[PDB]
Design a protein around this ligand. Structure first.
Ligand code: ZN
Length: 290
């Protein structure tokens, strides 16, 4: 039996906190620039071959976003690969806040942004120390969360979201890129979260959902990964499935956590035990692929 490393939730939690400590990671801000440098630096320290994808992405309102997708690759020559995704930007508006006064205020995005990234940094650390059989790509996607605000009077186009993933899906970081499958982590740090099988994931990658939920159960996380269909959610994996044609699932809580797109999406609501359940399940999956 392959040795599956132990996900260190304390370290993952640190990596979440480190991102949040920059402040909001809103595209076109200095805090976003600084955190991108931190993330690329950490991947490089953890033995990844780092590729940066800088792109001028146009937001719903015409704003040019100076975006940066960050890719860290392990065993880059291997043609048998697994892609692991998380968005790293944070939403510029707390547009679901209970107080209307807060609807134009940027969120810290501890869960929505930092959590997936922090879990994947811990996975990168472990992959470097003991390489799985398959090549692993860690892909931090920018400009996911700049989609039309709720307070905007006008069209709310689906494609206003997930700008970095649309770009990456149309413009792979290496010519002829392919992966066997992908896993997207979105909001994987919240206290008490549970995860159901997401709808587009079921549509495009049902065998990958089966693989992940079976691994979760075997790893002791069957109360966190509930074997039931949940909601259909627009997220980066929709665009990866449609445009890149890589079978990709989303690990995302079931509605959204109460902190979503509020000013309360901060470290107070992050529980390292949620990070552990999700992270350990991902390790179980990627190390057992042949
Ligand atoms: Zn969000």
């Amino acid at each position: 039996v392959v040795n599956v490393p132990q996900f260190d939730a304390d370290s993952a939690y640190l990596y979440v906190k480190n991102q949040v400590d920059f402040g909001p990671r809103v595209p076109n801000t200095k805090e976003h620039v600084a955190c991108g440098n931190y993330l690329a630096g950490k991947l490089e320290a953890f033995g990844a071959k780092v590729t940066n994808q800088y792109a001028d992405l146009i937001a719903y309102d015409g704003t040019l976003l100076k975006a940066r997708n960050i890719i860290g690759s392990y065993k880059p020559e291997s043609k048998k690969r697994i892609a692991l995704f998380a968005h790293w930007d944070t939403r510029p508006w707390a547009d679901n806040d209970a107080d209307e006064k807060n609807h134009h205020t940027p969120i810290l995005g501890a869960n929505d942004g930092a959590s997936g990234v922090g879990a994947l940094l811990e996975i990168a650390r472990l992959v470097n120390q003991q390489q799985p059989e398959l090549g692993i790509d860690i892909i931090f996607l920018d400009a996911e969360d700049y989609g039309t605000p709720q307070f905007y009077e006008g069209k709310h186009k689906e494609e206003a979201w997930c700008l970095g993933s649309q770009y990456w899906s149309r413009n792979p970081h290496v010519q002829g890129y392919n992966a066997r499958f992908g896993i997207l982590l979105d909001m994987v740090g919240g206290e008490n979260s549970v995860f159901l099988k997401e709808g587009y994931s079921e549509e495009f990658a049902p065998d990958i959902n089966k693989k992940v939920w079976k691994a979760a159960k075997k790893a002791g996380y069957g109360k966190t990964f509930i074997d039931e269909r949940g909601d259909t959610i627009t997220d980066d994996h929709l665009f990866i499935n449609r445009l890149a044609r890589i079978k990709t699932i989303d690990i995302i809580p079931n509605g959204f956590p109460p902190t979503w797109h509020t000013i309360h999406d901060n470290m107070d609501h992050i529980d390292k035990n949620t990070l552990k359940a999700v992270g350990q399940t991902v390790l179980e999956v990627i190390y057992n692929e042949k």
